[PDB]
Amino acid sequence: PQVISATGVVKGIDLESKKITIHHDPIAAVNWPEMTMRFTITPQTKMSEIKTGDKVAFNFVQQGNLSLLQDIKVS
Ligand SMILES: [Ag+]
Numbered sequence: 001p002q003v004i005s006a007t008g009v010v011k012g013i014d015l016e017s018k019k020i021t022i023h024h025d026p027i028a029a030v031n032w033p034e035m036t037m038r039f040t041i042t043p044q045t046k047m048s049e050i051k052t053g054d055k056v057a058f059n060f061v062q063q064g065n066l067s068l069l070q071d072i073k074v075s
Contacts, residue, residue: 001061003070004029010054011036018042020069022056030062039069046071 008024023036039060050056058072
């Protein structure tokens with residue numbers, strides 16, 4: 001779209017199911033308060049090495065009921 005930047009903390013990562021759970025700060029761009037959400041990852045998501053408990057900066061777009069990561073790095 002409509003790429004949306006957020007920050008948060010990694011709560012869980014699963015490269016098998018292709019999900020990363022992030023506790024993120026509010027996102028006024030889409031009227032989300034503080035929440036823990038599953039973000040979808042693809043072979044195309046630009047990744048740095050991130051671990052559970054890491055503080056992260058990330059970009060994502062929305063399409064379907066999926067929130068799809070375009071990249072993610074450690075903050
Ligand atoms: Ag959310």
